[PDB]
Amino acid sequence: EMRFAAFKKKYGKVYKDAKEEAFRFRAFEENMEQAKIQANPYATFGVTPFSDMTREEFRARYRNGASYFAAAQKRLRKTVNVTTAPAAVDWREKGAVTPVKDQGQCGSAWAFSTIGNIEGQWQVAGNPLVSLSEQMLVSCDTIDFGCGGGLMDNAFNWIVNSNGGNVFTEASYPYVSGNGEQPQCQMNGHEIGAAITDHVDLPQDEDAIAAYLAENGPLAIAVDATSFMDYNGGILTSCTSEQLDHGVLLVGYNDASNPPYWIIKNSWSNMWGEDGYIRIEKGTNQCLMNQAVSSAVVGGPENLYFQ
């Protein structure tokens, strides 16, 4: 019970009354209880920022998400061929990944997946790495549902087809939905951080995805997040893989490991997992990561062989 107080003191949790805290502790107890059930064996599980909440709300927080992906799955995805694969790449070292962020009490992970992907593709184009705005998407993308959820595909389409291929920087358009508030769209007072021309979807092939990632940079993926709750670190190997319900970002992989793994960036700050990051086994479709991979396309200047 000391480690629950440690938890409270670590995340500044100030409960309403005895009753509200009462469950959170029972709930904390059960989350710690379940954490030793999953104890992906070769990964670590423990206390995270949501050991306070129950796995009925968690699974409820995704009910919408699940239903958006299932609806997207029913529609035709145009896959793009991959020209074809280094045993290991990791775009974090290659300055193609920004510090981890926090979606807060907002169902806005779709927006974080999109922004993260865009940032990676923009930097791999050969631009200076630059944080970009999720708020833009959360408040201004009328295809999607802001804190209610959305699809990366919808948002790629909104940027290109309703915002000229333009993405505003985080600095100029700051993330303020952390608290679940949804202010009106603000078109003025922003600086454009990046430009996209289109987006592509990728086939449901992990080998294919890796080659395009290795070649082009971080991609927006969707996973089943059910096994993510109590994760502290390691490589997941029995990820629950039943229903897609969360948008994350694939930043790399490594084949020279036993077993090999994908490197994924999440929108739950850094206090969660491996500094905001999770590793899942590659090549067995863990968390169904291959089902909804997609990537913005960067073009622009082409003076490579002209100077």
Numbering used by the authors: 38 to 76, 79 to 123, 126 to 348
The authors write:
To prevent autocleavage and to stabilize the proenzyme, we introduced a mutation into the active site of the protein, C150A. Here, we present the 2.8 Å crystal structure of the active site C150A mutant of the uncleaved T. brucei rhodesiense cysteine protease pro-rhodesain under acidic conditions. The proprotease structure contains two parts, the N-terminal prodomain (residues E38 to T123 according to uniprot numbering, ID.: Q95 PM0) and the C-terminal core protease domain (residues A126 to P342). The first 18 amino acids belonging to the prodomain, a short loop between the first two helices (residues 77/78) and residues G124/R125 at the C-terminus of the prodomain, are not resolved. The cleft between these domains harbors the active site triad residues C150 (mutated to alanine in our construct), H287 and N307. While the overall architecture of pro-rhodesain agrees with related proenzymes including human cathepsin L or C. papaya papain, pro-rhodesain displays a unique extended α-helix covering the entire cleft between the L- and R-lobes of the core protease domain. However, and so far unique to pro-rhodesain, a bulge forms around residues N103pro and G104pro, whose backbone amides are not involved in hydrogen bonds. Importantly, this bending of the α-helix enables the guanidino group of R100pro to interact with the side chain of Q144 in the core protease domain. In the pro-rhodesain structure, the S2’ and S1 sites are partially occupied by R100pro and S1’ by the side chain of Y101pro while a glycerol molecule sits in the center of the substrate-binding site. In contrast to the continuous α-helix observed for H3 in pro-rhodesain, the structures of all other available, nontrypanosomal pro-CathL proproteases display a mostly unstructured peptide in the C-terminal end of H3.
Rhodesain is the lysosomal cathepsin L-like cysteine protease of Trypanosoma brucei rhodesiense, the causative agent of Human African Trypanosomiasis. The enzyme is essential for the proliferation and pathogenicity of the parasite as well as its ability to overcome the blood–brain barrier of the host. In the cell, cathepsins are expressed as inactive zymogens where the ∼215 amino acid papain-fold core protease domain is preceded by a ∼20 amino acid signal peptide required for translation of the protein into the endoplasmatic reticulum, and a ∼100 amino acid prodomain required for correct folding and lysosomal targeting of the protease. The prodomain interacts with the active site of the protease and keeps it in an autoinhibited state until it has been successfully trafficked to the acidic lysosome lumen.
